[PDB]
Structures are given as C-alpha cells and as structure tokens.
Ligand binder design. Structure first.
Ligand SMILES: [Zn+2]
Ligand SMILES: [Zn+2]
Ligand SMILES: [Zn+2]
Lengths: 266, 114, 44, 134, 65
C-alpha cells in the first residue's frame, strides 16, 4: 500500500509470525505494548457465591474464574459498567453466568469451564462464551469435588483492560526481534573466546544479509525491519489482536489530537 | 491497603485535564505539555515522530515517577512555527502510518491458510 | 439456629440450654453454618 | 531494585504469583469463676450495658457470634460476650484493628469443665505488595 | 493446590493442559519433556508451570466432611 509494511510468514488460529517493514522502532514497540495491555476484553469480574463446600476457598476460586478466557469478539458493542447508566450491572455492559456443580459419583467430579452457563441476555452479540481449545471440549479445570461436595455461584463478566488486571490480557506472548546480525551494534556481545561460535544464530538470519568484514560500520543505518510473532489466548482471534492493537493505539493517539482542540476554546 | 486503585492509570480524576500546556521559561519558543493517564506507550511514540519534523529543534519525554501514569513532553520549534502545530502534525503523521499499517496487514492476512 | 455437626452432616438447630453435643453421633463439636447474606468477590 | 530490594512483575502477580491464604483464629470462653456467676455469649445492647466497644455489633447473630460468610474489617465485633457484674459488662472480641477479611468457620463446643467456648477463624487472601520480603 | 488458570509469566492458558499432560505421561508412556512439547507448551516460562506443579487437591478431597 504505502508506508509500514507487513509480510505474514506463518498463520494459524493461535499465531501470526510476520515482518513489519518500514516503521520507526518506537511505533513497532508502542504497538506491542498496546497489544499487551490495552485492547479490551470481557472477563469475569464479580463472583457472588451461594454454596461452596469444596476443598478450595471462596476467593481462591473467584480468582481462577477471572482467569478463564471468555469470548470477546463482539466486545466493542458491550459497555464499560463505569460508563453505562444503569445501577451496578446490566445487559448492555455485562454478561452474567452461572456455575452449578455437585459431586454425584464416587469418582472425583471435575468442574470445567464448559460447565459455565451464560444467563444474561447476550442479545445477538458474540460474547461471553468460555473459549475452549481443549481437545475433549472441557477447557480449563476450575475445581475438583469429592462425594457430597457442592459449589453454587454466579459470575458477572465485565469489559476490562489488561492495564487494570492481567486477566483482560488478549495477548499471551509477543515475540519481537530486529537486526539479527547486530549490524547496528545495539548490543555488545558478552563472550569468552568467540562471540560468533558461542551465541546461537537467530532464525531470522536467513532473512538478512550477513555483514562483510570487507565492510566498515554502517553508522547512518536505522532499525527498519522487525520480526514479530503474536500468540493469542483466544478471547479474540489472532489477526484481531494485532488489528485492534493498531486500532487502539491509533485511537488513543487521536484523543490527544481532539484534546488539543478542546483547549483552544475561549 | 495503601495501594491506589488500578483504574487510576487510565481514568482521569476530579478535574484533571488530559493535556496541560505550559510556556517553557528556559529557552524561547518552547513548551512543556503534561499528559495525565498515559505512559511510554504514547510518549515514546510522539517524541520519536516529532524527531522527523525538521523544524523541531528539541523533543523529549519523561516519566518523573513510575507510581503515576503521567509524563512530560518538552518541545522546541524554529521561530514562527508554534510547537502545538508540531505536536498536531506529529500525532496525525502517526495516525496515517497506523492506518496504512492496518490495511496493509489486513490484505496480507486475507491471503493466508490455517 | 442451625449448626452442622462435625463427624456428622446435619443442621442441629439446637439452642442454648440444649448444650452439646448433637443428634445421632456422640461427638460434641459443632460448626456454625454459612450465612444467608451472600458476599461478593472481585474476581481479581 | 537496589540494596537488596527487588522488582516484581505486577502482571504475573495478578495471575496469582506468590499469593497466600491467611487464616486467623480468635477464641473465647464462658466465665471460669463462681456458682451464680456466668459470662454469657449474646449480642449485647448498649442499653445500660456499658463497656461497649467502638465497632458495630451488627454482624453478630442472636447467639453472639458471626456467621461463616460475613466480611469483617476494622474493629468489627466478632464474638459477643457479657460478664454479669452486680446489669452487665462487655467482654466482646474485636477483629484485629489492622486486619480485615471474611469469616471462615465458627466452632462452638463445650470445654472439659462443661464450659461453652468458641473458636472463630477469619480468612484473608494476601497478595504480594511493595515491601513484602522474599 | 490445583493446576494454574494461566502461566504467571506470559499469560498463556495452561489450565486445560493438566489431564492431557497426565495422560501423555502414563497412558502412552511419554517423557515429561516430550509430553510438555506435545501440549504445545514451548517457551519454558509456561513449561515449568506444569512440570513444577503439585496437585495437592487430590490429597484434600481425601478428607470426608
Ligand atoms: Zn449496565
Ligand atoms: Zn453428629
Ligand atoms: Zn508462560
């Protein structure tokens, strides 16, 4: 197209290995940060507990509940509870879900995130369903029950940002690497006998040209190419973590622009 | 027990403007904007792009304490060029690269498999 | 009001002057039962 | 992280790094003296019953004890007891001034002398704060 | 206690991996490193979340109440 340049190498439901040409270091960084802490998501953020005769403590459970990845695809049409005009929560701003588990068997009864049951009105929005990449279809092991054990509780999922708690973090890992031959001398390699024989070769070295000893130091050069890999938990597909990331960053750059106009008034 | 709430990193408070502009008293034609509820995510991006504008004499940001989500941007421009415009062109410039980045990524994504 | 027995599961709603232990067990040691006024937890 | 301090990953912490449960057990007992003297477990009322604390008794059920669900904090009374000295004098047990948490379990049992006595145990989760030794 | 809802370091979801891990071990006789790799736990930040984990719940359920 025009400026910054993308080149997928590998793609999957869970990962996007790509190359981000023609961008400032600053921008390629600021994007990774945003991808980590600032694309919003839905995640359980309140647990009212009715009965817990389980081996685990109330809040100890409540905690894990927060960590269970809930579908956040249509998240942009759910609201921040702090924003929405209702008192406490509602259907515009919060999914509510139910968990019932009782040990019937002699054998240990497990409780998975499949056992989570949406209850509030999704009203069409693609939201709140626990992500399940598990192979036998019960992602995440909430808790374990003995024979007479019961656990009955209700969770209100809210829209949140990973800055506020790492539960609402859409990104898992975000691999990131530039200049794989130190042609910019951005590190000084620690060594014992030989930098080259001791430090292993980055996989991103088949992609650049090795320097020549017949060449001197290129001092004018800048950091240009960037080798990232975004891995997603699943509450948002991969492609979207990067996109919404670019979207959010851009979005917040913007409110700064607007804020400058707000001040100009007399 | 003495911890601040975590929303306090992105939610503004009781009468805290997002930007605050002050005339730098040291050097002429220079300004120092305070960005409440922001961090290196923003600051490093604005300052690095302000460095490409060839009528910007000076540009640097700083988080005076990590406890607080806020940072100071200091900008000096050549005579006649008001620094706010240097900020404005700067932001916009970023927004345009970001947009191009998004579409360029999309088309690339729409060509893949698995 | 009620008080689930120890080595025995029940709701012996026995009061004062009824003293311990319980019913159909022989072991005195009564745990109170969970309240009704349910509490909330921030899932953090 | 200078001079034997350290920097901890706040993000990691949220996913439950170095988190602990913290249980404290309070304990009280009905008198130990007299033949016509017996301290009583009850929720007293400030009506003449001096020796009242600063905290609310409002979380005490009729028998003088909290229920295993109630959040407690500050100087909440947890165990209500009066020593009848000739109306009454208060002998109730405030939750530790600096603590706060949720009642976990209440044990009402008799003691070897046929004394009714009680063991209240409160529960806090404690998340690694600035200044915690590792 | 019980598997971790997620790795502390990265953020990856390791909670659905526990049973599948224990099966790869005993059912088809794999070794923990291989087992951990088949579960797609590559980076060692989340690899130790499973290997170093101890299931104290199995003991806790032993108590009648
Ligand atoms: Zn609402
Ligand atoms: Zn019994
Ligand atoms: Zn990890």
């Amino acid at each position: 197209e025009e400026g910054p340049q993308v080149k997928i190498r590998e793609a999957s439901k869970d990962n996007v290995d790509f190359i981000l040409s023609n961008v400032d270091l600053a921008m390629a960084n600021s994007l990774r940060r945003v991808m980590i802490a600032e694309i919003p998501t839905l995640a359980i953020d309140s647990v009212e507990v009715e009965t817990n005769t389980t081996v685990l403590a109330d809040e100890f459970i409540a905690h894990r509940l927060g960590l269970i990845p809930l579908q956040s695809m249509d998240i942009e049409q759910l609201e921040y509870s702090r924003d929405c005009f209702c008192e406490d929560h509602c259907d515009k701003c919060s999914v509510v879900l139910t968990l019932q588990a009782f040990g019937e068997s002699e054998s240990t009864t497990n409780v998975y995130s499949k056992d989570l049951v949406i209850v509030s009105n999704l009203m069409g929005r693609n939201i709140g369903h626990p992500i399940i990449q598990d192979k036998e279809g019960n992602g995440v092991l909430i808790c374990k029950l003995r024979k007479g054990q019961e656990l009955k509780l209700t969770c209100v999922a809210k829209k949140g940002i990973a800055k506020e708690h790492a539960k609402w973090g859409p990104a898992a890992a975000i691999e990131f690497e530039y200049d794989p031959w130190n042609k910019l001398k951005h590190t000084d390699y620690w060594y014992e006998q030989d930098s080259a024989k001791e430090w292993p070769q980055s996989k991103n070295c088949e992609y650049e040209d090795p320097p020549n000893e017949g060449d001197p130091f290129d001092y004018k050069a800048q950091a240009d190419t960037f080798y990232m890999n975004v891995e997603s938990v699943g509450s948002i597909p991969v492609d979207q973590v990067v996109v919404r990331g670019i979207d959010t960053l851009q979005k917040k750059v913007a409110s700064i622009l607007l804020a400058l106009t707000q001040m100009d008034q007399d | 027990m003495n911890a601040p709430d975590r929303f306090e990193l992105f939610l503004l408070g009781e009468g805290e403007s997002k930007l605050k502009i002050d005339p730098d008293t040291k050097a002429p034609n220079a300004v120092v904007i305070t960005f409440e509820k922001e961090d290196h995510t923003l600051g490093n991006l604005i300052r690095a792009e302000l460095l490409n504008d060839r009528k910007v004499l000076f540009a640097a940001y700083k988080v005076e304490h990590p406890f607080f989500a806020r940072f100071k941007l200091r900008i000096q421009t050549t005579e006649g060029y008001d620094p706010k415009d240097a900020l404005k062109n700067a932001c916009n410039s970023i927004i345009n690269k970001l947009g191009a980045l998004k579409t360029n990524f999309e088309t690339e994504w729409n060509l893949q498999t698995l | 009001l009620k008080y689930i027995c120890a080595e025995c599961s029940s709701k012996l709603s026995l009061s004062r002057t009824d003293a311990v232990r319980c019913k159909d067990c022989g072991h005195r040691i009564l745990l109170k039962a969970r309240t009704k006024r349910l509490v909330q937890f921030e899932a953090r | 992280n200078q001079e034997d301090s350290m920097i901890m990953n706040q993000s990691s912490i949220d996913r439950g790094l170095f988190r602990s449960l913290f249980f404290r057990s309070y304990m009280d007992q009905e008198k130990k003296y007299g033949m016509s003297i017996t301290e009583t477990f009850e929720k007293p009322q400030r009506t003449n019953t001096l020796r009242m604390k600063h905290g609310t008794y409002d979380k005490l059920d009729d028998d003088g004890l909290i229920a295993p669900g109630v959040r407690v904090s500050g100087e909440d009374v947890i165990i209500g007891k009066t020593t009848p000295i000739s109306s009454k004098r208060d002998a109730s047990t405030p939750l530790r001034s600096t603590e706060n948490g949720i009642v976990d379990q209440v044990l009402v049992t008799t003691n070897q002398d046929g004394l009714k006595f009680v063991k209240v145990r409160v529960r806090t989760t404690k998340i690694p704060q600035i200044g915690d030794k590792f | 206690m019980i598997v971790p809802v997620r790795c502390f370091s990265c953020g990856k979801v390791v909670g659905d991996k526990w049973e599948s891990y224990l099966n790869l071990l005993q059912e088809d006789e794999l070794d923990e490193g291989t087992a951990l790799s088949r579960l797609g736990l590559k980076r060692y930040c989340c690899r130790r979340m499973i290997l170093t984990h101890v299931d104290l719940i199995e003991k806790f359920l032993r108590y009648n109440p």
